[PDB]
Design a protein around this motif. Structure first.
Motif: not given
Lengths: 196, 69, 24, 130, 124
Positions: B1-19
């Motif tokens: 972890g933690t900032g390099k996590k895939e979920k964290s990266r998607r949150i940073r990029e703001g593209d986790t909504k589509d899933g």
RNA sequence: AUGGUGAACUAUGCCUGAAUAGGGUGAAGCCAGAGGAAACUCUGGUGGAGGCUCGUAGCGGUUCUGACGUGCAAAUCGAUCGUCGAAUUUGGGUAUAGGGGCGAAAGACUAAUCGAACCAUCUAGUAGCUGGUUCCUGCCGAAGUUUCCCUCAGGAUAGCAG
RNA sequence: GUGAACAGCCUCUAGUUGAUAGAAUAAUGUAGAUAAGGGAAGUCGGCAAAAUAGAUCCGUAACUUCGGGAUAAGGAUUGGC
RNA sequence: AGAACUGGUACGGACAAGGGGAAUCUGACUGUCUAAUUAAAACAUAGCAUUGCGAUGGUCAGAAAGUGAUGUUGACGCAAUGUGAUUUCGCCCAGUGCUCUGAAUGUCAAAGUGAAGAAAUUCAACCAAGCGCGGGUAAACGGCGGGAGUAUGACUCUCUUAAGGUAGCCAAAUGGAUUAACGAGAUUCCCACUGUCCCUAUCUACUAUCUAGCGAAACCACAGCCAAGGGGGCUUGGCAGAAUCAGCGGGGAAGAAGACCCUGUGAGCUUGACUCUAGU
RNA sequence: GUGGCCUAUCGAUCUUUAGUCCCUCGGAAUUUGAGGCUAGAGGUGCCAGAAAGUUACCACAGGGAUAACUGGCUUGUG
RNA sequence: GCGUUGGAUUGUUCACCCACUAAUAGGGAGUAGCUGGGUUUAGACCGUCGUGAGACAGGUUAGUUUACCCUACUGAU
């Protein structure tokens, strides 16, 4: 990996049998701290694994009737039978070890101490020397230029030998083959050949 | 972890909504289109069960007769 | 097309062109 | 069928490739891409340029260049590939027949449907859609 | 040297491709014309000696006299014999190596060892 | 996974000893003679350095439609070959012990076992799967079709006879 | 002794006669050889054999980092008294 | 070293012992490795270039030490790398990496502080590193079509063909890496040569062959004649006379067996795959 | 003047609300607070949907290989 | 019924040319007997992909084997 294995020091230990001995300046004592003592460089002998030749200098024990032998790093220009003066009052002559405070600014010295009592820590390789670039009497500290070019300030009580370490120009000759490199590393340590 | 996590990266990029639309191995590199393009070299093989019957046919190998109307 | 500078491209110094060797 | 698996590499176990074993039209600016990028393969020997079109009227038939493929049934992905696959409608250069519609607007192109299977024949036959 | 094409990438957008050497058949390509080009390996030719007059015609005497040692030849068989004698390229007791010297000369001519060229068209 | 054993084979550092015929080429250094004001440029001599070379002891095993292939040998034999004054070969001792050591680096050696060495315990592991399942007679006597977990696998379930 | 040689062979001091043998010499094999004419036309491929082999003398090219090539190459002798 | 005489089918008379030459690719060499299928263009080499470190330092080891290797050491040294002799040696801050001028409160864990409540508990401000925003960084992380014109480069206009008589302007001899030597590396060709061949034949010692003595192993449901039909056995025919010996390698059988794929399992390796963690 | 309008699915298992005297908090009580429970209001709007590859360095347990008619199977005339 | 040959070519050799001869016709049984290309395994070198392990559109290179058992065939008691 090899670098990590080097920490264990199993087969990478230095081959210390043929080394003449630790090269260090005279112990800083009352005689050297206040006055100076005279020593005779009996002979100079090559040290295995070291490019700078060593000089055998003998000093009489101030507190006992005996002769104390010391192994100084030979400076270019010194010769067998020369008298070496060590102490605060020693003159500015090649081969003498003087406190950095006593020598004037601009003097070139080698085997200079980092702190008083270390018996010589800097400028030990062949052809290397430091330059005293400035004096600071207030809280006496000596500014010196190290061989790498970095500028450092150390206590003026630190001692050093006037001149330059002998053996300069050693690395100016191409080795021309693996045999000479193997012979050179035979006595230094197990660090050759270096696999990619 | 933690900032390099895939979920964290998607949150940073703001593209986790589509899933669910994310393709397997949607790492920092190899965007979905890149992953799909690269996987074609290794996805040209059929899938069979224990027996095994042809569970999935190879690409461009559906082996079906269409109605050419 | 860009300009071509033929002043460069030093011609290979073939032994034939050299006048050091002669048999006259 | 029509998609022969082509295997590549020293150990032929990563085919990933498909070859169209039926005649196809590939336009004028085909210009094969690099090997590593091409997946579907249509050999040049199978590429047809001129199709035989029979005129329903006058009983005359002429050899005319193929212009494009518009509607191939059975997963028109093949239409995109341009496969003939008898039953397909293709554009043809009707200029030779000299068909002229009302108003002086001479027609140099019209639709046509291939009537023969190019797989088993070395020629393309089509019926002009008048 | 190159038997099959290969893809090479530069600038990430353009790919270089090199194909084998292609020669178009034609009755006017008589072996003498083909050989003096880099088309054919001179090793496999049956009689390299007979081609020396062609290289003499295609090159000035000065260029050979400079690259090649002592000169003044006519009836190029004499040239081959003299060059073999001078260079020690002679068969056993003692005929000069006519084939080897001619093959080496053709190799040098084809591989750019000697200076030669064809006059461009008339200037205008 | 836990607890233990290994460098007598082999990998490397180190200490201490031992061994390497006969030839070919001729570097520095030096000598005599002839030229040049000198540096120096040649002729004739000594010289024996090359991590020079052919070639023995020694080390290795490139090549053979070679020998034998339950063979002398679980790696030998004949020819042939690289090298043979050193980065040479090697005896004894010592240090490096397993996800470690070592490796002029082949994923190579680490006791005929190595992309993870050998002994004991959990351990009779996990059995998905291949194999087998031991005496006799009489009566009865099938199933391969249907439904549901998005699915493959895994299966529940109507069904077939007492 | 021969021999450049601790190279190959014979003999001297010394040590052995130890490897199951007897009777022929069929085919095919193991190891080593000879050959009329052509000299690689055989074979994927000069695969294997063969050819020059030491010493003395004449002589030695392209290239080159000038050190090397080099035993280059190409040629003439070797006995005994 | 030289001169006669002399035997020759000989004359390094046995042993002894380079074949040579013309070229290409590859690596500089010497050298070393996959013991037991791969010796090489592989590894290593001196040379070349980069990076961290001046001792309260770097590379590390260690359960931990009042611990240990480099270090009997000090920048001409140690530690980590890419290439591998001599000679040869268009443009990017546009992205991405490296290092932080610069903000200042966006993201703020623990601890600490201020409020509400009878108190658990809730709220609020501030805020370390790091993360965001924002600068520099040219032998690198990679990108591009070039020149000028346009109150600012984002933007908007415009376009590019001269060469001369077989060897040159120019450059500090040479203008190449088409690099010499070296190689049990691979490849092309030539002289010699020869049974590779036309086309095979002959010889020598031992096997094979018989005998004196000793004496197995692989394998073995049982055995061993064939033709046709059957979605070595069964059916129809040819046939069929004990016991056997020497070649034999077509089948039966084995040696082989592993090859090459398909389906369920393990582990050698790798990154912003997930959960953790040594170190910092 | 016609030769066209728009479109991803998932939650009825998530967001709430009230106990007029609903019960319990297991030593007696009151109030916060916690758990059950019976009625009401919004629900697919708010949110994302389990965590990647190589193996020719390979290892082990099972099934297939290796081929020439399903249907006399082929031939000289698009 | 008897013959249907000697050869060059792999920067390919799913063919081809020229020499004789009367002719150089087409096909099956194929032959772990030997084989060269091809399936080729841990080696190694250049390019593509991929941030990586690695494989590929390439390419180059170094890398069990019978019989004495039975039958089948040639000879011999």
């Amino acid at each position: 990996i090899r670098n990590q294995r080097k920490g264990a020091g199993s087969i990478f230990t230095s081959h210390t049998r043929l080394r003449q001995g630790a090269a260090k300046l005279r112990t800083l004592d009352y005689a050297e701290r206040h006055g100076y003592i005279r020593g005779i460089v009996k002979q100079i002998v090559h040290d295995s694994g070291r490019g700078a030749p060593l000089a055998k200098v003998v000093f009489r024990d101030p507190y006992k009737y005996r002769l104390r032998e010391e192994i100084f790093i030979a400076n270019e220009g010194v010769h067998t039978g020369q008298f070496i003066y060590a102490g605060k009052k020693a003159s500015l002559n090649v081969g003498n070890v003087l406190p950095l405070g006593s020598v004037p600014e601009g003097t070139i010295v080698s085997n200079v101490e980092e702190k008083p009592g270390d018996r010589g820590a800097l400028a030990r390789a062949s052809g290397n020397y430091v330059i005293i670039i400035g004096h600071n009497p207030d809280e006496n500290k000596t500014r010196v230029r190290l061989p790498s070019g970095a500028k450092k300030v150390i206590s003026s009580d630190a001692r050093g030998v006037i001149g330059v370490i002998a053996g300069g120009g050693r690395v100016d000759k191409p080795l021309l083959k693996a045999g000479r490199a193997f012979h050179k590393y035979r006595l230094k340590r197990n660090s050759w050949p270096k696999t990619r | 972890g933690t900032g390099k996590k895939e979920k964290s990266r998607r949150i940073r990029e703001g593209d986790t909504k589509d899933g669910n639309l994310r393709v397997k191995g949607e790492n920092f590199y190899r965007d979905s289109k890149r992953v799909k393009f690269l996987n074609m070299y290794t996805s040209g093989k059929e899938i069979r069960n224990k027996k095994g019957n042809l569970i999935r046919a190879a690409s461009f190998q559906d082996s079906t007769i269409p109605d050419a109307r | 097309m860009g300009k071509q500078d033929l002043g460069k491209l030093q011609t290979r110094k073939m032994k034939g062109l050299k006048s050091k060797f002669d048999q006259g | 069928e029509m998609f022969k698996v082509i295997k590549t590499g020293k150990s032929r176990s990563k085919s990933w490739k498909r070859m169209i074993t039926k005649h196809t039209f590939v336009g004028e600016g085909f210009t094969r891409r690099p090997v590593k990028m091409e997946r579907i393969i249509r050999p040049s020997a199978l590429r047809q340029k001129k199709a035989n079109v029979t005129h329903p009227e006058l009983g005359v038939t002429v050899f005319l260049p193929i212009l494009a493929v518009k509607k191939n049934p059975q997963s028109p992905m093949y239409t995109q590939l341009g496969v003939l696959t008898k039953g397909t409608i293709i554009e043809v250069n009707v200029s030779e027949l000299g068909m002229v519609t009302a108003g002086g607007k001479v027609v140099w192109g019209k639709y046509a449907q291939v009537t023969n299977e190019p797989d088993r024949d070395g020629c393309v036959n089509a019926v002009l859609l008048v | 040297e190159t038997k099959v094409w290969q893809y090479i990438t530069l600038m990430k957008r353009i790919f270089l491709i090199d194909c084998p050497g292609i020669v178009p058949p034609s009755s006017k390509d008589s072996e003498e014309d083909i050989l003096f080009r880099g088309v054919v390996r001179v090793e496999h030719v049956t009689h390299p000696e007979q081609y020396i007059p062609g290289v003499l015609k295609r090159c000035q005497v000065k260029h050979l006299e400079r690259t090649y040692e002592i000169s003044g030849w006519k009836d190029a068989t004499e040239f081959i014999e003299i060059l073999a004698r001078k260079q020690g390229r002679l068969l056993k007791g003692g005929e000069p190596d006519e084939s080897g010297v001619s093959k080496q000369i053709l190799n040098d001519f084809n591989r750019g060892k000697i200076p030669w060229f064809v006059l461009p068209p008339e200037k205008e």
